[PDB]
Protein backbone atom coordinates (compact mmCIF):
# COMPACT_ATOMS: atom_id res chain seq x y z
CA UNK A 1 0.00 0.00 0.00
CA UNK A 2 1.38 3.49 -0.22
CA UNK A 3 2.40 5.66 2.64
CA UNK A 4 3.86 9.11 2.75
CA UNK A 5 6.93 10.53 4.46
CA UNK A 6 7.66 14.27 5.08
CA UNK A 7 11.33 15.04 5.09
CA UNK A 8 13.15 17.72 7.19
CA UNK A 9 12.91 20.10 4.15
CA UNK A 10 9.17 19.51 3.85
CA UNK A 11 9.22 17.38 0.72
CA UNK A 12 6.79 14.47 0.81
CA UNK A 13 7.91 11.17 -0.65
CA UNK A 14 5.76 8.03 -1.41
CA UNK A 15 6.70 4.51 -0.27
CA UNK A 16 5.26 1.18 -1.19
CA UNK A 17 5.03 -0.95 1.95
CA UNK A 18 3.18 -3.84 3.61
CA UNK A 19 2.02 -3.54 7.22
CA UNK A 20 4.43 -6.35 8.24
CA UNK A 21 7.46 -4.23 7.07
CA UNK A 22 9.77 -3.29 9.94
CA UNK A 23 10.64 0.32 10.63
CA UNK A 24 14.19 -0.64 9.65
CA UNK A 25 12.84 -1.81 6.23
CA UNK A 26 10.94 1.41 5.87
CA UNK A 27 14.15 3.43 6.60
CA UNK A 28 16.00 1.46 3.91
CA UNK A 29 13.06 2.41 1.53
CA UNK A 30 13.62 6.02 2.33
CA UNK A 31 17.38 5.78 1.63
CA UNK A 32 16.68 4.18 -1.79
CA UNK A 33 14.83 7.40 -2.81
CA UNK A 34 16.40 10.29 -0.83
CA UNK A 35 19.85 9.17 0.28
CA UNK A 36 19.20 9.62 3.93
CA UNK A 37 21.11 6.92 5.83
CA UNK A 38 18.85 4.93 8.16
CA UNK A 39 21.37 5.79 10.92
CA UNK A 40 20.20 9.43 10.70
CA UNK A 41 16.45 8.76 10.26
CA UNK A 42 14.07 9.25 13.09
CA UNK A 43 10.45 8.68 12.16
CA UNK A 44 7.25 9.70 13.94
CA UNK A 45 3.65 8.78 13.43
CA UNK A 46 0.76 10.19 15.35
CA UNK A 47 3.13 11.79 17.93
CA UNK A 48 5.17 8.60 18.52
CA UNK A 49 8.83 7.86 17.60
CA UNK A 50 9.02 4.55 15.59
CA UNK A 51 11.39 1.75 16.84
CA UNK A 52 13.45 -0.04 14.13
CA UNK A 53 12.56 -3.62 15.17
CA UNK A 54 8.81 -3.07 15.27
CA UNK A 55 6.43 -3.26 12.29
CA UNK A 56 4.20 -0.69 10.73
CA UNK A 57 1.16 -2.63 11.99
CA UNK A 58 2.48 -2.40 15.59
CA UNK A 59 1.87 1.38 15.27
CA UNK A 60 -1.47 1.10 13.41
CA UNK A 61 -0.09 2.76 10.30
CA UNK A 62 -2.69 2.50 7.46
CA UNK A 63 -2.78 3.19 3.74
CA UNK A 64 -1.83 6.77 3.05
CA UNK A 65 -0.71 7.54 6.55
CA UNK A 66 2.03 10.25 6.70
CA UNK A 67 5.18 9.76 8.80
CA UNK A 68 7.56 12.70 9.55
CA UNK A 69 11.26 12.55 9.68
CA UNK A 70 12.56 14.40 12.74
CA UNK A 71 15.83 16.00 13.89
CA UNK A 72 17.20 15.49 17.40
CA UNK A 73 18.83 18.78 18.37
CA UNK A 74 22.46 18.64 19.64
CA UNK A 75 22.42 19.74 23.27
CA UNK A 76 18.55 19.80 23.53
CA UNK A 77 17.25 20.41 27.06
CA UNK B 1 23.47 40.41 1.49
CA UNK B 2 20.18 39.69 3.32
CA UNK B 3 19.04 36.49 5.09
CA UNK B 4 15.77 35.81 6.99
CA UNK B 5 15.29 34.06 10.31
CA UNK B 6 11.82 32.68 11.16
CA UNK B 7 10.79 32.55 14.84
CA UNK B 8 8.28 30.41 16.71
CA UNK B 9 5.70 33.28 16.80
CA UNK B 10 5.87 33.39 12.96
CA UNK B 11 7.79 36.65 12.96
CA UNK B 12 10.69 37.15 10.52
CA UNK B 13 13.94 38.84 11.49
CA UNK B 14 16.00 40.22 8.59
CA UNK B 15 19.82 40.31 8.92
CA UNK B 16 22.42 41.89 6.71
CA UNK B 17 25.24 39.38 6.29
CA UNK B 18 28.14 38.34 4.17
CA UNK B 19 28.81 34.80 2.86
CA UNK B 20 31.98 34.69 4.95
CA UNK B 21 30.07 35.34 8.18
CA UNK B 22 30.21 32.52 10.59
CA UNK B 23 27.24 30.93 12.30
CA UNK B 24 28.66 32.48 15.57
CA UNK B 25 28.42 35.91 13.85
CA UNK B 26 24.78 35.34 12.89
CA UNK B 27 23.80 34.39 16.48
CA UNK B 28 25.68 37.53 17.68
CA UNK B 29 23.59 39.75 15.24
CA UNK B 30 20.43 38.14 16.58
CA UNK B 31 21.52 38.89 20.12
CA UNK B 32 22.23 42.55 19.15
CA UNK B 33 18.81 43.12 17.60
CA UNK B 34 16.53 40.81 19.64
CA UNK B 35 18.21 40.34 22.97
CA UNK B 36 18.55 36.54 22.78
CA UNK B 37 21.81 35.14 24.08
CA UNK B 38 23.71 32.98 21.53
CA UNK B 39 23.66 29.92 23.94
CA UNK B 40 19.82 29.95 23.77
CA UNK B 41 19.83 29.89 19.97
CA UNK B 42 19.63 26.89 17.60
CA UNK B 43 19.57 27.68 13.83
CA UNK B 44 18.12 25.14 11.24
CA UNK B 45 18.71 25.37 7.42
CA UNK B 46 17.83 22.72 4.85
CA UNK B 47 17.04 20.10 7.45
CA UNK B 48 20.29 20.52 9.50
CA UNK B 49 21.32 22.24 12.75
CA UNK B 50 24.02 24.80 11.96
CA UNK B 51 27.34 24.51 13.83
CA UNK B 52 29.00 27.64 15.26
CA UNK B 53 32.26 27.75 13.28
CA UNK B 54 30.90 27.17 9.77
CA UNK B 55 30.41 30.05 7.42
CA UNK B 56 27.19 30.80 5.72
CA UNK B 57 28.72 29.73 2.32
CA UNK B 58 29.88 26.38 3.95
CA UNK B 59 26.16 25.58 4.25
CA UNK B 60 25.24 27.04 0.82
CA UNK B 61 23.17 29.66 2.59
CA UNK B 62 22.62 32.26 -0.15
CA UNK B 63 21.07 35.61 -0.70
CA UNK B 64 17.49 35.54 0.60
CA UNK B 65 17.85 32.14 2.23
CA UNK B 66 15.74 31.60 5.35
CA UNK B 67 16.89 29.96 8.56
CA UNK B 68 14.63 28.74 11.46
CA UNK B 69 15.43 29.91 14.94
CA UNK B 70 14.47 27.44 17.59
CA UNK B 71 15.12 28.66 21.14
CA UNK B 72 15.70 26.59 24.21
CA UNK B 73 12.50 26.51 26.25
CA UNK B 74 12.77 28.19 29.65
CA UNK B 75 11.89 26.75 33.02
CA UNK B 76 10.18 28.41 35.94
CA UNK C 1 -11.40 35.19 31.33
CA UNK C 2 -10.54 34.40 27.76
CA UNK C 3 -7.19 33.32 26.45
CA UNK C 4 -5.92 32.29 23.09
CA UNK C 5 -3.93 29.28 21.86
CA UNK C 6 -2.03 29.35 18.60
CA UNK C 7 -1.47 26.00 16.84
CA UNK C 8 1.11 24.87 14.25
CA UNK C 9 -1.28 25.48 11.37
CA UNK C 10 -1.72 29.11 12.38
CA UNK C 11 -5.16 28.45 13.79
CA UNK C 12 -6.01 30.49 16.88
CA UNK C 13 -8.55 29.17 19.27
CA UNK C 14 -10.19 31.05 22.15
CA UNK C 15 -10.73 29.24 25.48
CA UNK C 16 -12.85 30.40 28.43
CA UNK C 17 -10.72 29.61 31.53
CA UNK C 18 -10.36 30.67 35.20
CA UNK C 19 -7.14 31.53 36.99
CA UNK C 20 -7.52 28.38 39.17
CA UNK C 21 -7.51 26.15 35.98
CA UNK C 22 -4.57 23.78 35.84
CA UNK C 23 -2.34 23.28 32.86
CA UNK C 24 -3.97 19.82 32.60
CA UNK C 25 -7.51 21.43 32.54
CA UNK C 26 -6.46 23.70 29.69
CA UNK C 27 -4.92 20.79 27.71
CA UNK C 28 -8.30 18.98 28.13
CA UNK C 29 -10.01 22.06 26.60
CA UNK C 30 -7.60 21.91 23.71
CA UNK C 31 -8.27 18.21 23.20
CA UNK C 32 -11.97 18.97 23.14
CA UNK C 33 -11.46 21.20 20.03
CA UNK C 34 -8.38 19.91 18.16
CA UNK C 35 -8.17 16.27 19.03
CA UNK C 36 -4.69 16.26 20.57
CA UNK C 37 -4.13 14.05 23.66
CA UNK C 38 -2.92 15.95 26.71
CA UNK C 39 0.20 13.76 26.86
CA UNK C 40 1.10 14.99 23.30
CA UNK C 41 0.68 18.72 24.10
CA UNK C 42 3.19 21.12 25.55
CA UNK C 43 1.99 24.67 26.09
CA UNK C 44 4.44 27.54 25.88
CA UNK C 45 3.92 31.00 27.35
CA UNK C 46 6.38 33.82 26.50
CA UNK C 47 9.02 31.09 25.63
CA UNK C 48 8.52 29.25 28.94
CA UNK C 49 7.41 25.64 29.02
CA UNK C 50 4.33 25.29 31.18
CA UNK C 51 4.16 22.31 33.54
CA UNK C 52 1.37 20.07 34.65
CA UNK C 53 -0.02 20.53 38.11
CA UNK C 54 0.37 24.28 38.04
CA UNK C 55 -2.50 26.69 37.53
CA UNK C 56 -2.74 29.61 35.05
CA UNK C 57 -2.55 31.91 38.12
CA UNK C 58 0.77 30.34 39.23
CA UNK C 59 2.16 31.59 35.87
CA UNK C 60 0.24 34.89 36.08
CA UNK C 61 -1.49 34.24 32.84
CA UNK C 62 -4.28 36.91 32.67
CA UNK C 63 -6.83 37.78 30.07
CA UNK C 64 -6.06 37.59 26.39
CA UNK C 65 -2.71 35.95 26.88
CA UNK C 66 -1.53 33.79 23.98
CA UNK C 67 -0.19 30.27 24.51
CA UNK C 68 1.70 28.39 21.77
CA UNK C 69 0.76 24.73 21.43
CA UNK C 70 3.73 22.44 20.57
CA UNK C 71 3.76 18.65 19.81
CA UNK C 72 5.07 16.36 22.58
CA UNK C 73 6.09 12.81 21.59
CA UNK C 74 4.46 9.92 23.46
CA UNK C 75 6.89 7.58 25.29
CA UNK C 76 6.81 4.27 23.39
Amino acid sequence: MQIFVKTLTGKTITLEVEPSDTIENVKAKIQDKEGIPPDQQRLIFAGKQLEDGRTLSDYNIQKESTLHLVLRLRGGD
Amino acid sequence: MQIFVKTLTGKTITLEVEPSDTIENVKAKIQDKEGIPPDQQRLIFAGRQLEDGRTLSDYNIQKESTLHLVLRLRGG
Amino acid sequence: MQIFVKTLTGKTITLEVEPSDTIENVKAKIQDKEGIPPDQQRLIFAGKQLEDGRTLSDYNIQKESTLHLVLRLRGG
Binding site: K6, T7, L8, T9, G10, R42, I44, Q49, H68, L69, V70, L71, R72, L73, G76, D77 | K6, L8, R42, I44, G47, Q49, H68, V70, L71, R72, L73 | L8, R42, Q49, V70, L71, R72, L73
Partner: peptide, 12 residues
Protein backbone atom coordinates in the same frame (compact mmCIF):
# COMPACT_ATOMS: atom_id res chain seq x y z
CA UNK D 1 12.61 21.82 22.39
CA UNK D 2 14.54 18.53 22.06
CA UNK D 3 13.50 17.88 18.51
CA UNK D 4 12.70 19.68 15.26
CA UNK D 5 10.65 18.78 12.30
CA UNK D 6 9.51 20.66 9.19
CA UNK D 7 8.79 23.33 10.40
CA UNK D 8 8.44 23.55 14.20
CA UNK D 9 10.20 22.41 17.38
CA UNK D 10 9.01 19.27 19.05
CA UNK D 11 9.28 18.16 22.65
CA UNK D 12 10.32 14.53 23.26
Amino acid sequence: XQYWXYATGVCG
